[PDB]
Amino acid sequence: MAPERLRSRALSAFKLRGLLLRGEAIKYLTEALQSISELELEDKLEKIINAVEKQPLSSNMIERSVVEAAVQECSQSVDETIEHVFNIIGAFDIPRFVYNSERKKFLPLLMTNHPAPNLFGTPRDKAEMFRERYTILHQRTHRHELFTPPVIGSHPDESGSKFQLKTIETLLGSTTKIGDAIVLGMITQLKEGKFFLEDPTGTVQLDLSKAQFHSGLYTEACFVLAEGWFEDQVFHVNAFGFPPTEPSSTTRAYYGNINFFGGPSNTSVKTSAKLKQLEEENKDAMFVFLSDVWLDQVEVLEKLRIMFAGYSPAPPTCFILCGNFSSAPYGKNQVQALKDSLKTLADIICEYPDIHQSSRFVFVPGPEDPGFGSILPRPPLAESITNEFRQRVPFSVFTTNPCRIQYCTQEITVFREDLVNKMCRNCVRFPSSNLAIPNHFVKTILSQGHLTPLPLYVCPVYWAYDYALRVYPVPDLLVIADKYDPFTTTNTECLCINPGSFPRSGFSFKVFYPSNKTVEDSKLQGF
C-alpha cells in the first residue's frame, strides 16, 4: 500500500476521533498497517482507535507505547496468558481509598488531600486507623434494614425497624433511662473491670452485667452495636452484637464495581465477561495452599518431593507456601538454613521440570521468619536470602504478609498469623460453645471487616498501612494461615479456610479450584 496515503488516512482517522499521534506513533502505525488494503484498512483503523481509547489516556496526544499496546491487542498475543489472569499484589501496592462522608463515596488518595502512607506515621495517623475502621463499619451499618422508613412508609412512625441508631455524644444529655438506646462503638477496658465504649464523638462506661450476646468472639477493640439504656454516665447494656456483614454483591451494587481489591483492573474483577471466560478456559484451574513449611527439616523436603510426585498429574497454576518456614527461626542460623532450604527446593523443582514450567511458587513469610517479621504488613523475605532462588526458579514470587492474590474474577487474601489464640486470650466474654471456634473467628473477622480486630500492641501495624489489613468488601477466599486448626468455613459468598501448619497437620494441606470455587483436602498424611 502507498505509504503517503496510508499515513494520511491513518492520521485523518485518529484526527476525526480527536487524537494526535506523535511522530514515532504514526511511523510505527504505518509500519504495522503496511500489509493491509482498503478492504480491511478502515475497519482495522477503527478497531485499533477503539483499543487506544479503551486505555487510560491522560491526554489527546498519543505516544508510541499506547498504539503499540493497542495494535498488539488487535493482534491478540493474549492467548494462554498469565497477565490479567493471575496476579500477586503486595500489601504496600494495594490502592489507598478513603471514604468521604459528604460525597458518600470512596475516593482514591490522588483525588484527595490525604498524604501517602509511610512507616514513620504522624500522631494523627495512629488515631486515623481506628477512626477509619469506625467510618467503614458506620457506613456499612446505616445501609442495613435498620434504616428509617421512607416518607410515610408506615402510617405510624417506626424506630428504624426497631434498630434506630445514635452516637455517644447524643445520649450524653437529656436521654437518662431511655430504654431503647442503640450505639455503634469500640469496646475498651479503659479502666480495669470498668469497661468503656468509644466512637469518634466520645466515650461512655459499659455496665455489661447482662450481655445477651449474639454468636461471635468479642474482644477488646471490637466494634459492636451496644443496645441498652443510659444513666449516671454509664450505658447499661441490654445486648451486644456485631454490625451485620454485607456480600460483595451488595457493596458493589451500592458503590459500583470499584476495584477495592486492587491489581491492574480498574473495575472489580468479579464483573468482567472476558475475564469470566478466561477463568473457565481451564476446567481444572487449580491452586495449592500450605503453611509453616519447615524446609530447614529434611522430613519436610522429602515429603515435599512426594507431594510433587502426587501432583505431577494435573499440576497447579501455582503453589502457595505460607510462612513460619522454619523449625528454628533463631537468626543467622536460620538465614543460612533458609538459603539452604531454597537451594534444596530449587533442586527438587528442577527434578520436576514439568511442574517447574507448569506451576508458579509464591511465599508469604510469617512473623517469626527473618527480617521485619513482628510488624504488619510484613515486607517480603530478605532478597539476599532469595537471590539464588530468584535466578534458579524465575517462576516464583516472594511477597509481603498479608498478600492479595487475584485469579481472574475471584479474590484471594493470604495472611500468616496465629490469630485465633490471640483473639481468645484477648476475649471480653467467653463465647458459647454451641458454635465452633473457627466459625466464631470467621464471623468476627467478617463482621469487624478487618484481619486484626485487636489492640495495636496485640497486632503491631504500621499506622498508615492499616487499610491494607481491611477485609472490605468480602473476598472469595480468606486464607488465614494459623497453627490453631486446619479448617474450611463459609459466609457471604466467601470460603474462609486455614491450611493449618504443615508439620502439625500431619502434613495435610489444602487445594482450591476457582473454576468452580471448590476446595479439596490434600489428605496426604501417610505420604
Binding site: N421, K422, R425, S433, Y457, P460
Partner: protein
C-alpha cells in the same frame, strides 16, 4: 536408655517416666489419672504477671499422653488459660534412687578418635595408647597425601602432666605412630565404620568412643552409628584452625597429641562438676553452661516447690506477651569529666564481680 557402671566398663537398661503436663484440669476434662495432687508450684502463675492473670493459685497435673491440647482451655484451681508445658528433660527416675554420692563415673576402656577438618584436607584422626596404627585419612589434593601424619603425629614430645592426670586411662599414654590413607566419598565413612566396629573388639565390643573433638561437620551426632555411648569428651572449638594444615608443630603435637591429655582434663572436669549436680559425661559446661545454675535452681524450686523450668528459644515461661512490658527490653555510668586535674594522683579504681555481690543484700 540409662547407661551406668558395674565393675566392668558399662551396663544399661531401658526406662520411662510419667512426663508431667501441668494440664491444670481434672474436673470437667480428664484422662487416665486424677492427678490433682499436692498443688504447690506457684512460680508459673507468678511468671504470668507479664501475661496479667488474677487469683492465680498454682496447678493441676497429668501425663503428656498425646501431641495435642485440650483446646477448651480452663482450670479448676482458678479459671483461665495456661501454658501447661514443662517436661523438656528427665533428671531422675520415679518408679529406686540412691543418694548419688560416690558417683565414680570413669569407665576404664575406650577407643580414641578425632574429627577436625579443612574441606580440602579433612583430618580424621585415630591415635591411641595401645595400638600404634593412626590416621590422617583423606584430602582433596588427590595427587598427594598429608605429610606431617608421620613425623609430627609422632610428636617427639611427651608432656610431664601425663604422669599426673594419668590414672583415668588403662594403658599409659604413648605417642609414637604410623598411618594409612584413602580418598573417595564412598570409602572414608564406610571404612571407618567397619574399622571402629572391629577396633572396639580389641577392648571387647561394649565400650565408649573417646572422641577428642568433633570440630569437623559437628561429627558428634552426624557420625556413623556408635553401637554404644558417645561421651562428651569433645573439646569446644578453641583452636579454630582453618589455615593450610601442615603446620604440625602446633597442629600436630598440640592439636592431636597434647589433646590426648584433654581426655583426662575434660572428663575430670566433668566428674568434679558432677559432684555438684550429678550429671558427669553428658554435661553442658564449657558450652553456655547454664545447666548447673538451671538445674540447681529447679531442684531448689522443688525443695520449696515453685517450678521446673520451660526453655523456649526466647526467654520466658509464660503465654501471650504485653509489649508494654517488653518496652524496657526495647530500650550509674556517670562521667564527672574532671578535665582539670586538682588533687593529682594516679587517678584510678576498678571493681569486679559486682553482680554476685549485688544479690547478697536482698
Amino acid at each position: 536408655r540409662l547407661w551406668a557402671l558395674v565393675g566392668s566398663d558399662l551396663h544399661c537398661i531401658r526406662l520411662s517416666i510419667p512426663r508431667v503436663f501441668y494440664v491444670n484440669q481434672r474436673v470437667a476434662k480428664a484422662e487416665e489419672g486424677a492427678s490433682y495432687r499436692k498443688v504447690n508450684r506457684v512460680l508459673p502463675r507468678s511468671n504470668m504477671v507479664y501475661n496479667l492473670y488474677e487469683y492465680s493459685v498454682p496447678e493441676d497435673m497429668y501425663q503428656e499422653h498425646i501431641n495435642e491440647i485440650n483446646a477448651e482451655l480452663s482450670a479448676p484451681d482458678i479459671e483461665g488459660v495456661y501454658e501447661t508445658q514443662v517436661p523438656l528433660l528427665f533428671r531422675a527416675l520415679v518408679h529406686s534412687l540412691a543418694q548419688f554420692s560416690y558417683l565414680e563415673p570413669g569407665s576404664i576402656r575406650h577407643i580414641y578418635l578425632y574429627h577436625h577438618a579443612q574441606a580440602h584436607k579433612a583430618l580424621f584422626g585415630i591415635f591411641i595408647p595401645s595400638q600404634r596404627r593412626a590416621s590422617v585419612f583423606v584430602l582433596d589434593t588427590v595427587r598427594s597425601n598429608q605429610m606431617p601424619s608421620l613425623g609430627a603425629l609422632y610428636s617427639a614430645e611427651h608432656g610431664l602432666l601425663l604422669e599426673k592426670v594419668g590414672p583415668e586411662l588403662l594403658p599409659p599414654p604413648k605417642h609414637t605412630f604410623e598411618v594409612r590413607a584413602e580418598t573417595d566419598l564412598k570409602t572414608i565413612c564406610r571404612a571407618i565404620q567397619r574399622f571402629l566396629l572391629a577396633y572396639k573388639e580389641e577392648r571387647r565390643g561394649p565400650t565408649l568412643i573417646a572422641v577428642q573433638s568433633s570440630w569437623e561437620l559437628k561429627r558428634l551426632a552426624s557420625e556413623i552409628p556408635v553401637l554404644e555411648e558417645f561421651p562428651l569428651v569433645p573439646i569446644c572449638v578453641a583452636d579454630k584452625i582453618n589455615y593450610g594444615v601442615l603446620d604440625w608443630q602446633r597442629h600436630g603435637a598440640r592439636r592431636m597429641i597434647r589433646h590426648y591429655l584433654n581426655l583426662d582434663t575434660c572428663l575430670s572436669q566433668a566428674f568434679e562438676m558432677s559432684r555438684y549436680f550429678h550429671i558427669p559425661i553428658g554435661n553442658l559446661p564449657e558450652d553456655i553452661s547454664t545447666f548447673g545454675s538451671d538445674l540447681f535452681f529447679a531442684r531448689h524450686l522443688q525443695r520449696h516447690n515453685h517450678l521446673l523450668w520451660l526453655s523456649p528459644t526466647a526467654r520466658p515461661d509464660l503465654g501471650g506477651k504485653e509489649a508494654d512490658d517488653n518496652c524496657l527490653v526495647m530500650e550509674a555510668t556517670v562521667e564527672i569529666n574532671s578535665s582539670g586535674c586538682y588533687s593529682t594522683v594516679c587517678v584510678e579504681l576498678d571493681l569486679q564481680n559486682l553482680a554476685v555481690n549485688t544479690i547478697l543484700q536482698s
